[PDB]
């Protein structure tokens, strides 16, 4: 793992010791190379997971997330070059350093064998994110957004720390290999129920749930493009990874302590997908779609069946890619008109014909167009739930309908229709942002070709 | 389309537009041309009968009774000229109506294939840059101070001046560009 | 009812301008510059080579792998002669009609 982390560190001196002109090229290229190096984790020729030390490891669940996190860095760097073009060299270097630190901390979190390192880094991913949001966001709601984002997470995480320390005092170690073989039934009691709550609510607030999801749209709306990308793609997957890892020691309390959360998720899916219809802000639309999608992940993880974990992993990967893509697409038009409203620019297929194919393909991946992996996850989650209770497919299906509806609405009222002739400032598409969409899309094709990689420990 | 409707609609205009809609819906019912001619003569007779009715109280009452009768026995699927609102080819070509400023972003390579056109275009742009201030002042200096406006534009009173606000009527993309 | 003297002059001016513009949209013979410039071989080029690769794939990968191509058994009829076994299916008992 050091062979993936130490290069990510040396990227920092490469960022600072580089000439102002060649600072972006070097870091971008070497980040691509590190994304390449991260592909050795897929060399799993057995059912024996990779343990590199007492601290670093990588299972079939953490490897996809690590590769996605190593691959998103250069895309964020690229997306973050049109803005920052008028900022000073030191500010650009500081932005790049924030992004690199995020990459490093996330790779650590996904490689961690122990839950205390996971927690420390889970929390350390707040500093660079908050800085990015509040320092390079454009409107004044930056600050309230950062506040929400900090304190939802911390108020959720503190109980998690208490519960981890309790488990330490009771068992002797917070290692994940040991806590899986040395396990005991949790006697059903209010104490252990509060332990379940403590262990879960931090992640549930980070996925997020329906009842607690207001920190996400504020951030995405008020966050620069890179922050939105990393947030949507990884900083939500963080909670699902945590739940999947920690739900082994909460058996069987998960059988009856889940109904509230399964239910909230299944219903908030509908609520959010419906919000995505009467929504003026494109970024808010993307965020509410993300919430609708993560609700399924939460429910799946709650029922903890193999099909369920598999669909959840696939949906995590695919949603990360496609949401990063949609935010890139939105910011493309934002850089022209400097407005987030989806009603102002509504004929962009008559000027950007190629960029519209990216909109089309993304909105098709947003909805479940097969054989996309955005669809296999939804399908296996639907199947797991149907097995759970045959009355879930009702809500699943109305969510499907609403999903198609608002994705089509997005692309229609944004690209199709009559062009806004007063928008003389609609410069053609930049090779850079086109490369961005291509790099977001092609990996989806490749995964759809080889889904065995993004299944997870269950398969 | 080219003209802006007035503040309110007079009575004669109301009657003429009712006449037009009635004759169109009647054409829609009376599909055959002879039938239509006959019932249109009848309709013109019905109109011309109360043509010299001077009073207004009864005029508006007749007009409203006629509007009621028209809403009744109204063809649900009336004929609608294709290129007109509600027609098959209404905005079928509004996707090829690319504005002109999309050429300011053209690449010199794309331009070298149409040199004469772009020379002419620069001529036009100079014309516009020259006429701008003059037409702006022509507008600001002849706004009725009564306080009520009319939405109609004035012509180029002075010679050598171009009519104000012409670059969007002129330069308007064609109606069937392919 | 009718165009006012001012609106009519406006229309005339806009009209001559429009009819100059549209005339300018007309192209000259030398533009676009556009620089610098076998009966049904499509059959071969688009059928034969593809058949070659597809026959390779089928015969040497799909077959040579189990339960890839499965054919509903061929119809056998009284009076026929099975090939491999040479078996002869007896004909049918004689109809009373």
């Amino acid at each position: 793992m050091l062979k993936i982390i130490l290069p990510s560190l040396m990227l920092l001196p490469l960022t600072w010791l580089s000439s102002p002109k060649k600072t972006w090229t070097n870091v971008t290229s070497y980040s691509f190379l590190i994304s390449l190096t991260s592909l050795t984790l897929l060399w799993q020729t057995d059912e024996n997971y990779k343990n590199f030390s007492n601290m670093f490891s990588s299972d079939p669940l953490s490897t996809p997330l690590i590769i996605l996190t190593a691959w998103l860095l250069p895309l964020m760097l690229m997306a973050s070059q049109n803005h920052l073009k008028k900022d000073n060299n030191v500010l650009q270097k500081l932005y790049i350093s924030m992004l690199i630190s995020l990459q490093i901390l996330l790779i650590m979190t996904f490689s961690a064998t122990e839950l205390i390192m996971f927690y420390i880094l889970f929390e350390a991913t707040l500093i660079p994110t908050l800085i990015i949001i509040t320092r390079w966001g454009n409107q004044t709601e930056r600050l309230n957004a950062g506040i929400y984002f900090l304190f939802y997470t911390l108020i959720g995480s503190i109980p998690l720390l208490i519960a981890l320390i309790l488990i330490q005092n009771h068992v002797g170690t917070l290692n994940l290999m040991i806590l899986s073989f040395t396990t005991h039934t949790l006697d059903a009691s209010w104490s252990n129920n509060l332990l379940w709550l403590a262990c879960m609510m931090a992640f549930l607030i980070k996925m997020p749930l329906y009842g607690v999801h207001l920190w996400l749209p504020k951030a995405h709306v008020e966050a620069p493009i890179a922050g939105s990308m990393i947030l949507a793609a990884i900083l939500l997957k963080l909670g699902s990874y945590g739940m999947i890892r920690i739900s082994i020691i909460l058996d069987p309390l998960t059988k009856y302590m889940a109904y509230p959360f399964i239910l909230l998720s299944l219903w908030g899916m509908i609520m959010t997908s419906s919000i995505c219809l009467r929504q003026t802000d494109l970024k808010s639309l993307i965020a509410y779609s993300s919430v609708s999608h993560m609700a399924l992940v939460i429910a799946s993880i709650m029922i903890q069946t193999p099909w369920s974990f598999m669909g959840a992993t696939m949906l995590m990967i695919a949603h990360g890619l496609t949401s990063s893509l949609l935010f890139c697409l939105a910011n493309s038009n934002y850089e022209r008109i400097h407005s987030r409203t989806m009603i102002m620019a509504r004929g962009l297929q008559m000027v950007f014909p190629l960029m519209a194919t990216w909109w089309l393909m993304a909105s098709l991946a947003n909805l479940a167009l097969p054989p996309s992996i955005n669809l296999m996850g939804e399908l296996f989650i639907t199947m797991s739930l149907f097995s759970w209770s045959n009355f879930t497919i009702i809500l699943m299906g109305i969510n499907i309908i609403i999903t198609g509806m608002y994705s089509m609405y997005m692309i229609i009222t944004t690209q199709r229709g009559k062009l806004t002739n007063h928008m003389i400032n609609l410069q053609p598409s930049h090779t850079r942002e086109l490369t961005l969409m291509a790099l977001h899309m092609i990996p989806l094709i490749l995964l759809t070709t080889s889904p065995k990689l993004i299944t997870g420990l269950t398969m | 389309a080219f003209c802006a409707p007035p503040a309110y609609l007079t009575h004669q205009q109301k009657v003429l537009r009712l006449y037009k809609r009635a004759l169109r819906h009647l054409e829609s019912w009376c599909i055959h041309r002879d039938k239509y001619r006959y019932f249109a003569c009848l309709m013109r007779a019905r109109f011309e009968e109360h043509k010299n009715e001077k009073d207004m109280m009864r005029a508006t009452q007749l007009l409203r009774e006629a509007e009621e009768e028209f809403w009744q026995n109204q063809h649900p699927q009336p004929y609608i000229f294709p290129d007109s609102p509600g027609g098959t080819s209404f905005e079928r070509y509004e996707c090829y109506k690319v504005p002109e400023w999309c050429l300011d972003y053209w690449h010199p390579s794309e331009k070298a294939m149409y040199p004469d056109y772009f020379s002419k275009r620069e001529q036009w742009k100079k014309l516009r840059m020259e006429s701008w201030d003059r037409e702006v002042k022509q507008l600001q200096e002849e706004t009725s101070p009564d306080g009520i406006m009319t939405e109609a534009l004035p012509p180029a009173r002075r010679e050598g001046d171009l009519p104000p606000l012409w670059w969007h009527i002129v330069t308007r993309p064609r109606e069937r560009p392919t | 009812s009718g165009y006012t003297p001012d609106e009519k002059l406006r229309l005339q001016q806009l009209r001559e301008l429009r009819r100059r513009w549209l005339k300018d949209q007309e192209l000259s013979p030398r533009e676009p510059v556009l620089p610098p410039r076998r009966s049904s071989l499509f059959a071969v080029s688009h059928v034969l080579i593809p058949m070659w690769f597809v026959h390779y794939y089928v015969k040497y990968h799909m077959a040579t792998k189990p339960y890839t191509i499965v054919s509903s058994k061929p119809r056998i009829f009284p009076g026929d002669t099975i090939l491999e076994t040479g078996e002869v299916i007896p004909p049918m008992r004689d109809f009373p009609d």
Binding site: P428, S429, T431 | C102, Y105, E110, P177, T178 | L27
Partner: peptide, 12 residues
């Protein structure tokens, strides 16, 4: 007879 067809910049 032929006419210039207006189009965006498709070079990029």
């Amino acid at each position: 007879k032929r006419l210039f067809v207006v189009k965006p910049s498709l070079y990029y």
